[PDB]
Design a protein around this ligand. Sequence first.
Ligand code: ATP
Ligand code: CFF
Ligand code: CA
Ligand code: ZN
Lengths: 193, 446, 144
Amino acid sequence: LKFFDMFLKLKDLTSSDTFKEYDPDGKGIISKKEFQKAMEGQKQYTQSEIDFLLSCAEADENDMFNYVDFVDRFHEPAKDIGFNVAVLLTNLSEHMPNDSRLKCLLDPAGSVLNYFEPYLGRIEIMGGAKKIERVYFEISESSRTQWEKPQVKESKRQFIFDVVNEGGEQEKMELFVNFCEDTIFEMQLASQI
Amino acid sequence: NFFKGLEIYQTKLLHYLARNFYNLRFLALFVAFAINFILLFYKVTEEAMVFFVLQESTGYMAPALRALAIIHTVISLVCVVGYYCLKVPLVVFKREKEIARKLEFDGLYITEQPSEDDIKGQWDRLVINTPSFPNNYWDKFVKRKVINKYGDLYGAERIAELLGLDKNALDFSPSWLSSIDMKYHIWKLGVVFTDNSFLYLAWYTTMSVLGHYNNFFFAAHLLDIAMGFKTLRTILSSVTHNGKQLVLTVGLLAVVVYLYTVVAFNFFRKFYNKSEDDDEPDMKCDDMMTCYLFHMYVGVRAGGGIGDEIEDPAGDPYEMYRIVFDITFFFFVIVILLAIIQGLIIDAFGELRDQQEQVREDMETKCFICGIGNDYFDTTPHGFETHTLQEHNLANYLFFLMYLINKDETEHTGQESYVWKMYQERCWDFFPAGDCFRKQYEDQLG
Amino acid sequence: MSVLGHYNNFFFAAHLLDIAMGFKTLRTILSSVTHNGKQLVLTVGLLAVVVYLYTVVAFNFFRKFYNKSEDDDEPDMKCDDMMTCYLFHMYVGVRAGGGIGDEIEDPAGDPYEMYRIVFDITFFFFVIVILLAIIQGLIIDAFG
Ligand SMILES: Nc1ncnc2c1ncn2[C@@H]1O[C@H](COP(=O)(O)OP(=O)(O)OP(=O)(O)O)[C@@H](O)[C@H]1O
Ligand SMILES: Cn1c(=O)c2c(ncn2C)n(C)c1=O
Ligand SMILES: [Ca+2]
Ligand SMILES: [Zn+2]
């Protein structure tokens, strides 16, 4: 979890306006000393984390490295693989709600679970064992972006008014699934546009 | 590469138009308001012959009006094009989806035939034989499913003929005139031109074009405000909400006024002289059509009925019959029927607003998915908000469907595979109806 | 306003409105005006737009019927200008009981008699009967 958290804060910290101040040129290159100073100024990384990040960075003979490639190399795999750990810990937390060891294990993972809150989707389905079950899945950022479009919101409002006012308790879910298919097409079209 | 690289620029222009449809609509409304503000300065001058002159001193209003007319026409055309690139694909998608579902699960054009009353199936018959069908609907193997489902009982060759599928392609083991599918595009034009929003946009653009023939046609665009604000759309809908009852009530009013006309034409004809000069009497009830028009026009709009608009019956043998005539006209027509006609619209307005408020209240006091009221979840702080934003959120169900579509079937887990199978079979038993995780594990969970 | 009342005594009349700020019923009546303010403004705008459309129609076609002068020497034509005709329709027509047909010349024995009849009846129905009643209801219902 420390590995994942350290490489998930990196995208936020390198994209901060403070970092842009520390690299006025914006050429994607920075010295190790200036990168260390930026990390210290952010005040989110400890000294061990900063030393580890510097050791990871492949500097030059001039003591400079392209931090954009550094972030591309380490943040993306972390963002890809840490979601599963987040889902595992969320599953355990929700299905063992009265456990102390689990909480003592979750405390180090607060900064990871808080990164995947936007990307973690929860639903409840009547499962095969005749019991309600919770399903966790991943949500892409483009999905939210298209769900926030004006035409999609118009379609959602029209559907909600139609179904709630006149849809009826029976056939409401068939109408909802039809709306879901139409909205998936609308979101694909909006991404194209 | 000219003549082939222009496609990128055309696509960029179309996307720009489709992406700013609402902004263009607002701009067109503003331009129409400016044009009508300029039209308020017209006047008619004889210097027989009447000429419409813009009574202004600055001198810039005529060129401004011409520029605004051209701008408005251009904006309306671009709005139509942007609608065609933003909302028409969804309409065609829905139509194709319903057609394909009917083909596969109802035998609409194989097992059965469309009714003669409805025009949708009759028009849809033109597309199933096309090669492009379905162009927007995702499922491109609907024809093969239909043939494999109905060939045994109805003959594979006949089905291929019906769906326009080549026999060799059917049995396959896994120039511009011909290139363009004119039949499918005719079907698409028929589908679009029966769309209400596209019809409104076409009417808007037609009036914009007519406004160059005569500027005052631009006045017709002011009514767009009634199609832009929810309150004014509700007011317009209130007229047709009770349309059948309204038409029947106006018919009853006309029948009652006809009966009064008959009575007044047989007996009270001397009282309908509307001429002050004795030389030329303007008798209004020597004919049945004239008397009927008088009663429907003057009498109904009169405050006190028809007794206000005809001669005083004092000192006449028919004075009491005339008094009863006038009082009953006032009561049945003015007091009773007009009030009912007005109520049929004002009440409809109130009812529509009540329905809107009731929908808003229902969403705020029930869960869309499970239907459990917010009383159950309000025992905890922000229970209902948490339930409808984390536990049962309809956006999350939409995102789960997208997640299932974009994930390999070999990678599906047990729950995803279960939901996907139920969705393929179109069984909606996996939605939590009247139940949730809290109710399921109320004891253990707490 | 108390200080202005020394400049002119009649400014003290403005203090009578304090009764509407002192009794609960009158405060409710005042609040009922602004309770549906957005809907009220939209409805008055729709009324103005409809009367503008009627003004356009009457300015193009029915201009001979808008002479409001008894003396033949000086005709007071009310619809030879668009602003004059619009003001006439908004002021005289809307406050008239039967619409604008009450306040203009009788169309009898004219080629445009039926168009004039339809014009008057529709003005009476859409404006007088429908829109004014809705505007009034938006306030009375808010009070209730
Ligand atoms: N299953 C549900 N999913 C989401 N919201 C729900 C659900 N059931 C009830 N609600 C309630 O619906 C309300 C949200 O309204 P709605 O879904 O129409 O969109 P909105 O956010 O209000 O609209 P807009 O963003 O267009 O202004 C919230 O109060 C939420 O409590
Ligand atoms: C494969 N697929 C799609 O590609 C699709 C869809 N709904 C919309 N689209 C685009 N569904 C339900 C689907 O199964
Ligand atoms: Ca597998
Ligand atoms: Zn629920």
